[PDB]
Amino acid sequence: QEKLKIGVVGVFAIGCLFPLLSDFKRSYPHIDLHISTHNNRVDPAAEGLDYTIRYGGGAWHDTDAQYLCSALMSPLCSPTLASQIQTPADILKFPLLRSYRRDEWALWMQTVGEAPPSPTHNVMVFDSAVTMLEAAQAGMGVAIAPVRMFTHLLSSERIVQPFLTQIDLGSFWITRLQSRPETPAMREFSRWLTGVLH
Amino acid sequence: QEKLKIGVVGVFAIGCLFPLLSDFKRSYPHIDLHISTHNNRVDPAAEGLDYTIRYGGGAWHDTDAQYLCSALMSPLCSPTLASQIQTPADILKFPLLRSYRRDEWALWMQTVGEAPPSPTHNVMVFDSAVTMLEAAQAGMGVAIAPVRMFTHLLSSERIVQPFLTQIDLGSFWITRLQSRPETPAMREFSRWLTGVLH
């Protein structure tokens, strides 16, 4: 077996990669895949990773970065909250849930023609979109995250997307440190993943 | 308003703290609470936190640590997986899901009188118990995590605890850097939380 160690941002692992892993095993049985998750804030050298699947803009320095897929973001909330939401302004009836990035809600609101939320607005901050959406399901507030990573919650009707407008503040990328040697197994995994996504 | 900034381990935020936050607001309306989540691997100084709610043994150096509650761990899996699990050995029909700690499964199995899982066993590693349990619900494998933090999944029947045996590899603690000044709002929040838990 050829070892491959991969650190995957949690939202991507649950929303995309995990369901597809048996297909990787089908195509490449000879690969010993060591999967670990992170919250997008990761040090691949320290963790001894071969690849890192992450969210961002693709321009990490001294990194070989390959595009996986888009991660368009939109408001997401429980059906109970959604019942009280008709216009974008109605989102402000409730606390906002955001990631460590400070601009998500300002940008989305601006795109839909609203003013920025009051600097006084009740806001909760999440290291992980997976945790954010757990809070959202429980009606803790309105989340903003990559819609396609929560198809499972949308289809099962645990979360609703009240508005069509989406924003791009990053995509999903797979990255190798340029100081890290690219192996046969790495090339094969990269080929499989960018391939199965298309 | 008095500002209070708190970084909370995700599993505790979803499984315990979030449901209780309106009760804090009832008792202490004058507090401006800034909640953020982390994956238990956090630097409170860098993040400028007042308090950190975390999982561990209570003996962080140069930290004032206060015990919140126990976090006994047991195997957790989907009903479909559980249907194929009668004895602890049956867990090994499926991949194991673990945290960054390397000893959880060895310890639990040893406690129930089994041998350690093969060093060859399919294992997936999670920065966050919240993400682990999402994977577990989807039948990706059998998780091990703090049972009382997933009452929501147990009650709704999305996850099952097949065995009664639990282990203690850590509890939940609230910690302040000794170099960080203890404020009025901090004392009041600490008092409320240790209080509402009892």
From Swiss-Prot, chains A, B:
Q: What is this protein's function per UniProt?
A: Regulates the expression of the beta-lactamase gene. Represses cephalosporinase (AmpC) in the presence of beta-lactams and induces it in the absence of them.
Example of a GO cellular component annotation carried by this entry: cytoplasm
Q: Which cysteines are joined by disulfide bonds?
A: none
Taxonomic lineage: Bacteria, Pseudomonadati, Pseudomonadota, Gammaproteobacteria, Enterobacterales
Compartments where found: Cytoplasm
Where does the secretion signal sit in this chain? none
Q: Does the keyword Repeat apply?
A: no
Primary place of residence? Answer: cytoplasm
Task: Specify the protein name.
Answer: HTH-type transcriptional activator AmpR
Q: Which gene name belongs to this protein?
A: ampR
Origin, by domain of life?
A: Bacteria
Going by the UniProt record, its keywords in alphabetical order are:
Activator, Cytoplasm, DNA-binding, Transcription, Transcription regulation
| Family from the record | Belongs to the LysR transcriptional regulatory family.
GO terms under biological process: DNA-templated transcription
Q: Per the record's keyword annotation, is DNA-binding included, yes or no? A: yes
Q: Give a GO molecular function annotation for the protein.
A: DNA-binding transcription factor activity
